[PDB]
From a paper:
While crystals containing full-length HpARI2 did not form, crystals were obtained containing the HpARI2_CCP2/3:IL-33 complex and we determined the structure to 2.1 Å. The asymmetric unit of the crystal contained one copy of each of HpARI2_CCP2/3 and mIL-33. The structure of HpARI2_CCP2/3 revealed that the two CCP domains, which are joined by a 3 residue-long linker, are not flexibly associated but instead interact with a buried surface area of 522 Å2. In particular, the 28 residue-long loop which connects strands β5-β6 of CCP3 extends ~28 Å away from CCP3 towards the base of CCP2. IL-33 interacts with both CCP domains of HpARI2_CCP2/3 with a total buried surface area of 1548 Å2. Most of the interaction occurs between the CCP2 domain and the rim of the mIL-33 β-barrel, with a total buried surface area of 1040 Å2 and with contacts involving the edges of β-sheets and interacting side chains. The β-sheet contacts are mediated by main chain hydrogen bonds between CCP2-β1 and β1 of IL-33, which extends the CCP2 domain β-sheet. Residue R159 of IL-33 lies at the centre of this interface and the R159A mutation causes a ~ 1000-fold reduction in binding affinity for HpARI2_CCP2/3. All contacts between IL-33 and HpARI CCP3 are mediated by the long CCP3 loop. Interactions with IL-33 are mostly formed by non-polar residues from, and C-terminal to, a small helix which docks into a small concave, hydrophobic pocket on the top of the mIL-33 β-barrel.
Author numbering:
A (entry chain B): 64 to 206, 214 to 237
B (entry chain A): 111 to 166, 177 to 266
Write the structure that this text describes.
Amino acid sequence: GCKGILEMLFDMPKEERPSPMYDSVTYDPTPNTPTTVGKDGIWNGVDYRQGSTVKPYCDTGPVIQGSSKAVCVSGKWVPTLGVCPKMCSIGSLKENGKFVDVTATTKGDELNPPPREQTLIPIVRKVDKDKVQHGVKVVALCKAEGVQEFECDNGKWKPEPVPCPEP
Amino acid sequence: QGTSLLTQSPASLSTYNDQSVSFVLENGCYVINVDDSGKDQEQDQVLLRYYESPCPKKVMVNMSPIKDTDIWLHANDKDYSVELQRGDVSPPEQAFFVLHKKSSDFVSFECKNLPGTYIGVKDNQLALVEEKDESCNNIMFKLSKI
Ligand SMILES: [Cl-]
């Protein structure tokens, strides 16, 4: 068996955990797994069944610096799971580039669709429309040909903005 | 039916009147306290484990303090109380409550084996209560991120 992803994380001090934290973690049973919880289930109260598949979800974007899914093999999750990325700030880009407008061109659920299991329990979350998920693309304006494209990469906009000329 | 997927998420657990459900070491073991002193609620988060179960449709939810994810809330029918139990003794299948969604993102937890009996609040502690014998808000809790 394998210790669960969140159990591993909450065994270490808060300063040693990745930030941000996974929003949810879903475990897929092998075809031979009879029950969801039990001595032969996905979870037996101590650890998680061998061959189970794990898929973390981050509301900040698709995971970075590792794999999006892993399998329980020999007490370890292989390959190494990715961690949650940081979001980027629309207002920060508008300010650093002196842009007149910044509009998102993709939604976070395109690259990072929420699992169905996230609707099972209402967990209250802070909403901040100024933040966009990792991997979301935007377009900024200068107010001819003054249109620049940007991508959110783990809290940083790519590429660096060419600040608009003084009107 | 196929085997239902199992999901886990951290959350902060609070009551209807916005009191923290916290965990404190008492004589060596963790107890559950309903606190309204304003202390930081980060260390007192819970680890939720939940899955769908076909009902003749039901969301089953299990709850552990992040301070010790090897123990979880459990309904004691021999004392009519809410306690923490460790997985080397108590079976995990008996450790899931039936989630009921209420208004304004509040939820309630019904005992799987004691229909109509819910997790409630009595004297700054969690207890088992009868839905009809209580007001709505007595069994209403809120799960919040961070
Ligand atoms: Cl233990």
